[PDB]
Design a binder for these strands. Structure first.
Ligand code: MG
Ligand code: ZN
Ligand code: ZN
Ligand code: ZN
Lengths: 271, 136, 56, 109, 147, 43, 559, 30, 196, 114, 65
RNA sequence: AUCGAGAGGAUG
């Protein structure tokens, strides 16, 4: 119900977005997925302070493990980047501090899940930093395992971040992408031995277009329209927002030029 | 600095796909002009050429050597062509074995052309500028 | 006539394997094994020990 | 001036053969100005192709033989059957001036 | 009970060993050029002498500890299997479960070792699946740039 | 660790080639690259 | 031979090497780390003070920096500490020991160094990470690859030397090898495998891609070439745009086989002025051949031009390739079901032609060839019967291969591999060998204890029927083992001869230099030749051209 | 049926029981 | 390297964004050049790869065991029944552009080893420093920060080039140069240097 | 040990302007701009939405060397038209699509069940 | 060592899934194949993260101090 | 630091 790009969703859920992105230039749809993959910001642990660690794993091994853990990133947009907050080092408006206390209680095995993480700083009342669980059993990932007199005391300072800086900040997982099922654009040349047609399978995407018809001659003037994507969320941002924030971030850094360009005109000609 | 250079009507006699898909070597001859044959390379993916056909073939060279080819926009600027199929090329030699006759050697950035007749003694020059137009 | 056979023989060795070395090279070699009267090997018996230069 | 004449003999038989009157006027129809060029041009090109006093051709030659030798270590020689000694083994004799050679051979015509 | 005999090299001169227990003494058909078989399978000598005495355990057993790591070594050019033999000894992983307790000059351990998706029946006795030294990585064979 | 504990040495006709009699006793492929190649054997 | 003829030396480095498609030919990737540590003695001249005083102050830690400053009285000011390290007034005559910077003289070798081309000068381009990076096409003269090979580097300390590096040792100068009249550097692997692809008749590029590529070539005249096809849809040929890498006034002629100035299947190679006319570009052309483009472009335009050519070619091919794709699967070593059958039947009438030559010899009818044993003429006989058997079956698989076959397409380019390799992988691997003779009797009158005695049949004596795809069998495996082993054995212990030879040759010729009288003489003045190589000509500036005064009719010569 | 002879897989069961004894360094130990 | 003498170094790293990608969304963890295949002739590497796919997919284990009735035909009769190109090829899309790659690409799971030898443990440079006791030449090894060897074999290559002043440097300025006093008659080093 | 910090793919050091704009010496009415700390997400898109303008003669980008973040756009247009404007007009078009994409997507999302 | 979080290639969180896996074998009497499909692991980039895992951790903890 | 041994990397 507009004049530009035409999206139509078929199936979508808590974690999956199946849609045809009609009527766009290719160069766009691509740049959409990339900025998606690794340009939207998120929160993830980015500093570990170790009190005691008598586990079988070594310090930096768990450190790394923590990074990867999916932290909630909803109202993330109203948290300054730690590299700007005039606060010396970390603070409350630029970081969510976390704490981890686990000991080998009994003689049987003591699992250390993420549910065992404790927010300590003021959330100034915003949706951010609650580590994420999807496990039916109610347990968030798995950090380390314990036996007897094994202690583990940690302090996590999670920060704002972009995947382009490190993949622990990726909200993306895997992004499905395809254009033109029956190859009518001859963008590919099939390798074969006999009937190229029986040699490759047809994607589910073929039921949404027509056969090429061998009796018709090759269509020259033809550009790439209509793309068959499918985005999957890691969970720190709902599915919908990833695609929405993506579009925003793109639009954002596209204008940060359109502006910066204008900030060089009334610079040399003015004074 | 314009105008045609050669004109005739030719008959397709052999369409050879020599281990290719996007190209053909075509053997076509002349009408009423008896001793005159033509060997051309035609991208069949765009302009399909079946055997037992007839093509109007025109040379001409109309409309700082190359002035950076500027995108078509032929809707407002008057064109040089009412033809289904055009190509730009170069001539690399003119064969004169005995004859009585004469032969031309052309290269459209890869596709080759050998033509055969005699009444072109003042028509074709040892030059860069050379086009090729085809219809029907 | 020796100079010529020694060359042919050095040559037939290089060329027997698909290789090619410009005449002007093997020639120089072949010649060094010649100017000293007769056939002069490429060992401490052949070259050197010929009032050349002690340090060398 | 005798050695000088003789050391150029070969090159000229190419020169004379390619700058033959029946040629410089038929195969490749040269003008006046375009000839004095070709001529004046070959002179300078030739003088460029002289060896430079300084060049150490000693090392050069050894290396130029030792390398392809370094690549001779192959097979060696499975037309099959030599049956004569070839490869490094032979080259070892050739340089030792070997009295006892594995495959001596007469060849008569 | 007399079913296995420790044979040395000298005594190996007087015996006629079979290769495949089953296919080396069943009967005639015969097969060779007789219809029908699987076109895609390999061509085997065939048993032609029959006055055997012994029979081999399983041919894969001609191999060594490092070599039995190689998947399908009988599809490789020989000198290659010798290379892998030297490198397998310079790969990286778990070298003993007690690495956190020993005190030896220099030792490397892999953050996340994996049992390979393709294995030898002989890896089983070498306990490679419990102490792997590689990762099943996704790999592409293409040109892509020129790096 | 396993491959070192099963190592065969040899001091100094043609004692580097893999000899028919090696079948099933010494491993064909296992052997060191260069330097002392074939004088050393793995069982 | 260890402390005088060859010393250890300072101002030197070493590290793993890796390729760079976007590096220049005479260049060399030198990690900041190293560039931070190697230093070059430079004097203070009113020409440099401004940049120097800046470097001094910049400190030994920010790349364009410097440790140490040498005064009149010969003092040594260590810039890693001291008190006046932020102070300091540089006047003329003093020296600053700056770090190594872009575009500098470095000598860059790789052992074993058995060439002049093993030691060459490169230009510095300081980079991130920790490898020495270099241009793929400077691969062949060093014999390097990137499977873990290390390389060395030496930094000059005096101007005389600096010159003496970039005037004689400079890489572009070395493009034409004085060893064999020919060019020793070329277009290798990816770029070569693709600069075939791009030049096929079928290969058409269009606007979006076309423009990028033009932009891709540096010093591109800034002129779109008129599209070959300008019919329904403006498209360019492959060859069309590659021609833009190639300079002007450069001419080339070939004629492979069926080359009638039309070429049924783009045979030969005709190049006029700055463009190309017909043919497919590959090894024979763009490769380091005798009559190839590189030999032509070098003697004609210069080194520096040819050196910039290498860059352009790659820069374009690479791009095109990168966005077209190339691969190799196992389907690239399968053959037709009808063919696979025909191969096994072309081994069966050649394993039977051997049973008769045995069946004969055994009833004493086989006459011995004059001068050889009865057993010698049987052996020679069979061995040939089995080789002819494989190349018959081999070249039966090379006719069954499709044109879309990636493995085939590499040979057709010349990037890697040849005929044999196809036959191995798909048809049959062939007979084995040691000492020259087929498989021996290690055990008494047999080969393995899985055989009877006195059995000279193919399978008993080491003929692997099966191919690398179908898989070897147990005995076969073990034989091929005895064979391959011989390879490693030689290279291990034979090289120590092929390398002792080199030392002798070198040591016996060594001091033979051409003098200012043009005669070839040694340390004693003793003449060796009276004109170097019989005519005083530098091997470099030479090429084989026919003397059309020999072959020819007693009569056609008059003509 | 305890009579029919060893086949394909059966050939391994023997191996494992060989190693179940001598392990991997028996020559060294013995 | 992998598991068939197929050794090599890492030349570069690309982020999941600039990498080729299948329509399923998968990225490859690493890319090797199809050129080091036909020349050195390792077919098994190619098979293991086509097996291990089928293993990951069906969620079973891989039977690479040497002599067996296992066929590259009977493998690909499996991968086919698994919605795939029976010889391992997979349509990919470029990264920078997302334009469908003209030629399909063989791509799959393949066990890869991580040998020792890492650049930062080979890397070495020196510009002056540690000298030897006897020779007054630079000391050997990189674990003493020493200099590299310019062996006769490298002296040769230099003389070939006719670069003379450079080779006087690589034997005086760097390394060894020393000053002594001699005699007008005898010509030994007996001279008593009572300098100043 | 020589690896350069990751935040160097988006942040800008001392005296590093986000755009440098330069006159092409080769052909008249042409320009070559140098985007800092950007890549194929940006370059590619600007080029295509720049070839839609019938008033443009030449456009294309390049990424010098994959170690550094930075591409180059080169633009030549009809005489009597500054390319800065051709850039300007292009960037708006993109935004106008995205702003409308975003809306169209919401209109859908709100609808779906799950 | 210990199950990793997120598959290297893709990223889909796999760290929470290890227990579930084991529990679907020994308790639910299934094969590794269908056990991976109950877990939401469709792509095979992930499938090899869990299939080819080895849980050395169990034998590590086996030591005392 | 010096002398002595062994293992490995690059040409296969
Ligand atoms: Mg190497
Ligand atoms: Zn703060
Ligand atoms: Zn005295
Ligand atoms: Zn995955």
């Amino acid at each position: 119900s507009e004049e530009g790009p035409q999206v139509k969703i078929r199936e979508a859920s808590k974690d999956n977005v199946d849609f045809i992105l009609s009527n766009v230039d290719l160069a766009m749809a691509n740049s959409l997925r990339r900025v998606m993959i690794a340009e939207i910001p998120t929160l993830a642990i980015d500093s570990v302070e170790v009190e005691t660690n008598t586990t079988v794993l070594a310090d930096e091994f768990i450190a790394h493990r923590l990074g990867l853990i999916p932290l909630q990133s909803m109202d993330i947009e109203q948290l300054e980047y730690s590299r700007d907050c005039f606060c010396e080092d970390h603070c409350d408006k630029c970081s969510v501090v976390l704490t981890l206390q686990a000991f080998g209680e009994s003689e049987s095995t003591t699992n250390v899940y993420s549910k065992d993480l404790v927010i300590v700083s003021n959330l100034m009342g915003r949706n951010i930093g609650h580590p994420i669980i999807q496990d039916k059993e109610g347990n968030g990932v798995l950090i380390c395992k314990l036996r007897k007199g094994q202690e583990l005391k940690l302090t996590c300072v999670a920060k704002k971040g972009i995947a382009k800086e490190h993949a622990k900040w990726g909200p993306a997982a895997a992004i499905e992408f395809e254009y033109d099922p029956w190859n009518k654009l001859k963008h590919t040349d099939y390798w074969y031995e006999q009937d190229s047609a029986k040699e490759w399978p047809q994607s589910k995407n073929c039921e949404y277009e027509d056969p090429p018809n061998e009796g018709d001659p090759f269509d020259y003037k033809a550009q790439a329209d209509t793309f068959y994507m499918n985005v999957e969320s890691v969970g720190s941002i709902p599915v919908d927002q990833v695609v929405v924030r993506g579009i925003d971030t793109l639009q954002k850094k596209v204008a940060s030029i359109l502006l910066a360009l204008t900030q060089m005109d009334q610079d040399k000609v003015n004074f | 600095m314009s105008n045609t250079l050669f004109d005739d009507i030719f008959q397709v006699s052999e369409v050879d796909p020599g281990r290719y898909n996007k190209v053909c070597r075509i053997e076509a001859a002349s009408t009423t002009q008896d001793q005159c044959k033509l060997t051309l390379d035609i991208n069949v993916e765009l302009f399909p050429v079946a055997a037992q056909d007839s093509l109007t073939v025109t040379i001409a060279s109309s409309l700082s050597a190359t002035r950076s080819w500027r995108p078509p926009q032929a809707g407002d600027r008057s064109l040089a062509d009412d033809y289904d199929y055009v190509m730009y090329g170069t001539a690399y030699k003119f064969e004169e074995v005995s004859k009585d006759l004469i032969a031309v050697y052309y290269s459209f950035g890869g596709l080759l052309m050998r033509l055969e007749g005699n009444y072109r003694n003042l028509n074709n020059l040892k030059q860069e500028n050379a086009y090729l137009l085809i219809r029907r | 006539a020796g100079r010529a056979a020694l060359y042919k023989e050095v040559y037939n060795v290089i060329a027997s394997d698909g290789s090619y070395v410009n005449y002007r090279h093997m020639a120089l070699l072949v010649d060094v094994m010649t100017t000293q009267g007769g056939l002069t090997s490429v060992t401490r018996h052949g070259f050197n020990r010929s009032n050349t230069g002690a340090l060398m | 001036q005798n050695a000088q004449r003789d050391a150029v003999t070969l090159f000229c038989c190419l020169l004379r053969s390619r700058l033959a009157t029946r040629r410089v006027l038929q195969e490749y129809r040269l003008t006046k100005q375009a000839f004095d060029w070709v001529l004046s041009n070959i002179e300078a090109q030739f003088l460029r192709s002289v060896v430079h006093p300084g060049e150490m051709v000693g090392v050069l030659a050894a290396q130029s033989i030792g390398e392809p030798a370094t690549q001779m270590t192959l097979n060696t020689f499975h037309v099959a059957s030599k049956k004569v000694t070839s490869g490094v083994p032979r080259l070892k004799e050739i340089l030792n001036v070997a009295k006892n050679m594995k495959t001596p051979s007469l060849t008569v015509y | 009970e007399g079913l296995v005999e420790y044979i040395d090299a000298e005594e190996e001169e007087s015996i006629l060993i079979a290769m495949q227990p089953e296919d080396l003494e069943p009967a005639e058909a015969n097969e060779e050029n007789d219809l029908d078989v699987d076109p895609a399978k390999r061509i085997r000598v065939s048993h032609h002498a029959t006055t055997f005495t012994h029979c081999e355990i399983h041919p894969s057993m001609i191999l060594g500890v490092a070599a039995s790591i190689i998947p399908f070594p009988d599809h490789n050019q020989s000198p290659r299997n010798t290379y892998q033999s030297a490198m397998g000894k310079q790969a990286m992983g778990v070298f003993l479960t007690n690495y956190n307790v020993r005190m030896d000059t220099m030792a490397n351990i892999l953050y996340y070792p994996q049992k390979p998706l393709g294995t030898t029946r002989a890896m089983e006795y070498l306990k490679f699946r419990e102490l792997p030294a590689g990762q099943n990585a996704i790999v592409a064979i293409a040109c892509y740039s020129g790096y | 660790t396993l491959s070192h504990l099963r190592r065969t040495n040899t001091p100094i006709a043609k004692p580097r080639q893999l000899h028919n009699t090696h079948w099933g006793l010494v491993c064909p492929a296992e052997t060191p690259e260069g330097q002392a190649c074939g004088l050393v054997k793995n069982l | 031979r260890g402390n005088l003829m060859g010393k250890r030396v300072d101002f030197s480095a070493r590290t793993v090497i890796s390729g760079d498609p976007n590096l220049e030919l005479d260049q060399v990737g030198v990690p900041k780390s190293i560039a931070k540590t190697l230093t070059y003695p430079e004097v203070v001249t009113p020409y440099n003070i401004d940049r120097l005083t800046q470097l001094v102050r910049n400190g030994p830690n920010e790349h364009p920096g410097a440790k140490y400053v040498i005064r009149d009285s010969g003092d040594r000011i260590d810039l890693r500490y001291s008190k006046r390290a932020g102070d300091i007034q540089l006047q003329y005559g003093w020296k600053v020991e700056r770090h190594i910077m872009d575009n500098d003289p470095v000598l860059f070798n790789r052992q074993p160094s058995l060439h002049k081309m093993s030691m060459m000068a490169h230009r510095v381009k300081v980079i991130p990470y920790s490898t020495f990076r270099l241009n793929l096409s400077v691969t062949s003269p060093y014999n390097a690859d990137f499977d873990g090979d290390e390389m060395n580097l030496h930094v000059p300390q005096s101007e005389e030397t600096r010159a003496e590096l970039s005037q004689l040792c400079a890489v572009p100068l070395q493009i034409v090898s004085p060893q064999s009249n020919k060019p020793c550097m070329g277009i290798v692997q990816d770029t070569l495998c693709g600069i075939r692809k791009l030049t096929l008749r079928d290969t058409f590029i269009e606007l979006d891609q076309v423009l990028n590529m033009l932009y891709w070539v540096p010093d591109w005249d800034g002129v779109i070439p008129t599209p070959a096809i300008i019919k329904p849809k403006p498209l360019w040929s492959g060859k069309q745009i590659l021609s833009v890498a190639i300079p002007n006034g450069i001419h080339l002629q070939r004629f492979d086989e069926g080359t009638t100035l039309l070429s049924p299947k783009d045979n030969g190679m005709l190049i006029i002025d700055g463009q190309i006319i017909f043919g497919v570009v590959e090894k024979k052309t763009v490769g380091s051949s005798n009559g190839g483009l590189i030999h032509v472009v070098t003697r004609e335009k210069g080194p520096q031009v040819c050196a910039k050519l290498f860059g352009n070619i790659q820069k374009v091919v690479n791009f095109w390739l990168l966005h077209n794709g190339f691969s190799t699967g196992i389907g690239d070593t399968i053959a037709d079901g009808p063919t696979m059958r025909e191969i096994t039947e072309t081994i069966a009438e050649a394993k039977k032609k051997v049973l008769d030559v045995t069946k004969e010899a055994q009833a004493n009818l086989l006459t011995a060839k004059h001068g050889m044993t009865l057993r010698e003429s049987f052996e020679d006989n069979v061995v040939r019967f089995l080789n002819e058997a494989r190349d018959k079956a081999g070249r039966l698989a090379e006719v069954n291969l499709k044109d879309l076959n990636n493995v085939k397409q590499m040979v057709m380019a010349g990037s890697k591999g040849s005929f044999i390799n196809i036959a191995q992988m798909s048809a049959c691997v062939g007979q084995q060998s040691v000492e020259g003779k087929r498989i021996a009797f290690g055990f008494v009158d047999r080969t393995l204890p899985h055989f009877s005695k006195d059995d000279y049949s193919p399978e008993s004596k080491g003929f692997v029927e099966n191919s690398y795809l179908r898989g070897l069998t147990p005995q076969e495996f073990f034989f091929h083992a005895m064979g391959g082993r011989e390879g490693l054995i030689d290279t291990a212990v034979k090289t120590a001869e092929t390398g002792y030879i080199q030392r002798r040759l070198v040591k016996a010729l060594e001091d033979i230099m051409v003098h200012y009288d043009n005669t070839t003489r040694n340390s004693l003045g003793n003449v060796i030749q009276f004109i170097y190589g019989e005519d005083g000509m530098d091997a470099a500036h030479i090429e084989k051209q026919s003397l059309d005064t020999i072959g020819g009719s007693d009569a056609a010569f008059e003509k | 049926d305890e009579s029919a002879p060893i086949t394909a897989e059966d050939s391994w069961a023997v191996i494992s029981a060989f190693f179940r004894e001598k392990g991997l360094v028996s020559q060294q130990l013995d | 390297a992998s598991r068939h003498g197929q050794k090599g170094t890492i030349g570069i790293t690309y982020r999941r964004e600039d990498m080729p990608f299948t329509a399923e969304g998968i990225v490859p963890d690493l890319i090797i050049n199809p050129h080091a295949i036909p020349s050195r002739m390792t077919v098994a590497h190619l098979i293991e790869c086509l097996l291990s796919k089928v293993a990951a997919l069906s969620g079973n284990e891989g039977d690479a065991s040497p002599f067996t009735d296992i066929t590259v035909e009977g493998i690909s009769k499996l991968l086919r029944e698994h919605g795939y190109q029976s010889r391992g090829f997979e349509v990919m899309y470029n990264g920078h552009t997302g334009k469908k790659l003209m030629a399909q690409i063989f791509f799959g799971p393949t066990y890869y080893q991580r040998l020792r030898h890492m650049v930062d443990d080979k890397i070495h440079a020196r510009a002056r420093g540690p000298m030897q006791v006897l020779t007054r030449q630079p000391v050997e090894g990189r674990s003493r920060d020493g200099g590299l060897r310019f062996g006769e074999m490298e002296r040769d290559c230099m003389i070939a080039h006719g670069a003379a002043s450079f080779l006087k440097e690589r034997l005086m300025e760097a390394s060894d140069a020393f000053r002594v006093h001699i005699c007008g008659i005898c010509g030994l080093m007996t001279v008593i240097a009572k300098l100043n | 040990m020589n690896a350069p910090d990751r935040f160097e793919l988006f942040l800008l050091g001392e005296g590093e302007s986000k755009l440098k704009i330069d006159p092409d010496t080769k052909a008249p009415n042409a320009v070559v701009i140098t985007f800092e700390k950007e890549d194929h997400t940006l370059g590619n898109l600007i080029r295509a939405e720049l070839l839609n303008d019938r008033k443009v003669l030449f456009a294309a980008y390049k990424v010098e060397h994959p170690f550094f973040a930075r591409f180059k756009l080169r633009i030549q247009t009809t005489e009597g038209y500054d390319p800065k404007d051709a850039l300007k007009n292009a960037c708006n078009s993109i935004i106008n699509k995205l702003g409308a994409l975003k809306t169209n997507f919401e209109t859908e999302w709100n609808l779906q069940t799950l | 060592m210990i199950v990793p979080v997120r598959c290297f290639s893709c990223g889909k969180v796999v760290g929470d899934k290890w227990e579930s896996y084991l529990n679907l074998l020994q308790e639910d009497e299934l094969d590794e194949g269908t056990a991976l499909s109950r877990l939401g692991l469709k792509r095979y980039c992930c499938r090899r993260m869990i299939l080819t895992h080895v849980d050395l951790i169990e034998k590590f903890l086996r030591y005392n101090p």
